[PDB]
Design a protein around this ligand. Structure first.
Ligand code: 402
Ligand code: SF4
Ligand code: SF4
Ligand code: SF4
Ligand code: SF4
Ligand code: FES
Ligand SMILES: [Mg+2]
Ligand SMILES: [Mg+2]
Length: 579
């Protein structure tokens, strides 16, 4: 219980690692491959090296403290070891930060500066083509940056339990990649991008849509609509040193105008649309007394999980399009009818916290009359890069508002970005629809928060119903495999692939791992959303006035006829085959 670190004595009953004990006691220990409570078991980076008297050099991140330990974190032996390991990394690292997309927030660069490290022989490949894989609609790899730290492999395992990201033996050398070095899209990968979030450097990235967007903007005849996800207004401010949990909605609208977008709408409008359709489908099922359960279908990471692991549930998914695609569909049909635009000249761009959204947008059948629902999807990070490249002073911009026709949104739509958000929003409408009433108690705190699996009983029209909120792809696996699905009859289930909801999406700003233990990123980003909900006068999707008018004037009644024909999408399992 007694340990000495750099000459300082501590008394403690704690059972923890040297790294965690030292950092709790404000002692600096560097780390690289340690993240998500694990390190690279096979190829330890050893950046967390410390000296334990009587033992030698040990890795602090996976060595437990023991009574009587005398530890030096900053001896010559230690600093030369760490510097040596960083130098070896530089030997396989294309160290050219100028045009690098992690230039502003790279963990490796920070370590190189800290230890004054240099390559024993600079790595300068002639042909990066063999190092880069951009076949995916969603994820790209640049192995000239890869430190083989395993953080993406561990994060895939931890977050999704698919292990789609693996170590591979290629040409007799170790790389990371997909099963058999396939394109990720052709594997059980969810394209959720949690591996990207985990990456300390620029080796993993989103598939860029930025030139699709800039081309559309500069095309004379193109009318470029832009619309951002719920999570974007709660996040993007982090990349302009505005801190965490800042609502920057009004600034984003202003910046998008300054970027030259022709119409400023909002995906939250599409969220209200999804609710209109999905809550209607839920009431339909309640009155048909089936089929049950109905699952949400707005998360393309979860749709891919269902496709790849549970195709028997594909017919249990709501046929309502996701906020992105339903908005997109409306952008090519309703929007011209109220604007005069030639549908073929409309180019619809979304801004998402999500890499999987790019795959969804590019699904061959997400189209009508030769017109894509969505033409481009850029991540939070990409929009930040566009803003910085345009030299727009984001933090000092005035607030503007969205164009109302497809920009208004309710508080129900606003909270989509948090785990349990869709559930809560959908219940607010379904209850009003089924009872043909406008109920006052609308908050469903039971489905909120970061618990991995959330259940609640709701009563609708003198009948009790069972709902569940699955928070993260690994938790969907747990729910199903453990038979939790069978311990009662579920009627409506929300699934999000990313733990925390879209606020923790694969397209979101990276956050430093130590600032990550300072701030709960999942809760602080979500707090912006719930707070908008609390202060909006319209808190149900079906009270959205521009939505109501669009339905009254163009689509008709949700869930039926026109709305069904246009605003819905069904996923179908493959017929039985041998082999
Ligand atoms: N389409 C859509 Fe969604 C909405 O609204 C986003 O835009 Fe999400 C967010 N934020 C993302 O990415 S998707 C999963 N449904 C919940 S939130
Ligand atoms: S990954 Fe980091 S260290 Fe490597 S070139 Fe990019 S910014 Fe520089
Ligand atoms: S995108 Fe998601 S599922 Fe695919 S390798 Fe990365 S973490 Fe795993
Ligand atoms: S892609 Fe990134 S997280 Fe994965 S091993 Fe390479 S450097 Fe580490
Ligand atoms: S939870 Fe949100 S960000 Fe994550 S994969 Fe699903 S839609 Fe994308
Ligand atoms: S951080 Fe401890 S071995 Fe990598
Ligand atoms: Mg370990
Ligand atoms: Mg233009």
């Amino acid at each position: 219980k007694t340990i000495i670190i750099n000459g300082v004595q501590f008394n403690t009953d704690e059972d923890t690692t040297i790294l965690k004990f030292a950092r709790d006691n404000n002692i600096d220990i560097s780390a690289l491959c340690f993240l998500n409570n694990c390190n690279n078991d096979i190829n330890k980076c050893e950046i967390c090296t410390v000296e334990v008297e009587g033992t030698g050099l040990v890795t602090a991140c996976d060595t437990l403290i023991e009574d009587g330990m005398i530890i030096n974190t900053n001896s010559d032996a230690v600093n030369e070891k760490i510097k040596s390991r960083i130098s070896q990394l530089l030997d396989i690292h294309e160290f050219k930060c100028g045009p690098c997309n992690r230039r502003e927030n790279c963990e490796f660069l920070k370590l190189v500066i800290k230890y004054k490290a240099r390559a024993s022989k600079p790595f300068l490949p002639k042909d990066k083509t063999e190092y880069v894989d951009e076949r995916s609609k969603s994820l790209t790899v640049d192995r000239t940056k890869c430190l083989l730290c395993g953080r993406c492999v561990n994060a895939c395992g931890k977050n999704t339990e698919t292990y789609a990201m693996k170590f591979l033996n290629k040409n007799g050398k170790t790389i990371i990649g997909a099963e058999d070095e396939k394109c990720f899209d052709d594997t059980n990968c969810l394209l959720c991008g949690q591996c990207i979030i985990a990456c300390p450097v620029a080796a993993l990235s989103e598939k860029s849509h930025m030139d699709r967007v800039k081309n559309a903007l500069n095309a004379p005849e193109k009318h470029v609509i832009v619309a951002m996800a719920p999570s974007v207004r709660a996040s993007i401010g982090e990349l302009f040193n505005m801190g965490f949990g800042v609502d920057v909605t009004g600034k984003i609208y202003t910046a998008l105008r300054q970027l030259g977008f022709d119409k400023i709408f909002d995906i939250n409008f599409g969220a209200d649309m999804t609710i209109m359709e999905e809550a209607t489908q839920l009431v339909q099922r309640i009155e048909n007394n089936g089929p049950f359960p109905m699952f949400t279908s707005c998360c393309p990471g979860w749709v891919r999980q269902a496709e790849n692991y549970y195709p028997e549930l594909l017919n249990n998914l709501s046929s309502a399009k996701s906020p992105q695609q339903i908005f997109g569909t409306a952008s090519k049909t309703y929007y011209p009818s109220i604007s005069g635009l030639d549908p073929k000249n409309v180019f619809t761009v979304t801004v998402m916290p999500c890499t999987s959204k790019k795959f969804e947008a590019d699904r061959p059948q997400m189209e009508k009359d030769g017109l894509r629902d969505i033409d481009a999807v850029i991540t939070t990070r990409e929009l930040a890069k566009m803003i910085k490249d345009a030299k727009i002073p984001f933090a000092k911009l005035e607030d503007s508002e969205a164009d109302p026709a497809m920009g208004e949104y309710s508080g129900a739509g606003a909270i989509f970005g948090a785990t349990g958000g869709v559930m809560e929003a959908a219940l607010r409408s379904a209850k009003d629809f089924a009872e043909n009433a406008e109920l006052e108690d609308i908050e469903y705190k039971q489905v909120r928060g970061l618990n991995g699996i959330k259940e609640a009983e709701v009563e609708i029209n003198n009948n009790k119903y069972n709902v569940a909120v699955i928070n993260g792809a690994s938790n969907l696996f747990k729910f199903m495999k453990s038979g939790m699905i069978n311990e009662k009859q579920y009627h409506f289930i929300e699934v999000m692939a990313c733990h925390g909801g879209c606020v923790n999406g694969g397209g979101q700003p990276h956050v430093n791992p130590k600032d990550l233990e300072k701030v709960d990123i999942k809760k602080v980003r979500a707090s912006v959303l719930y707070n908008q909900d609390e202060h909006l006068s319209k808190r149900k999707s079906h009270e959205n006035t521009a939505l109501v008018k669009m339905y009254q004037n163009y689509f008709g009644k949700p869930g039926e006829g026109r709305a069904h024909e246009i605003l819905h999408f069904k996923y179908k399992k493959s017929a039985w085959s041998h082999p």
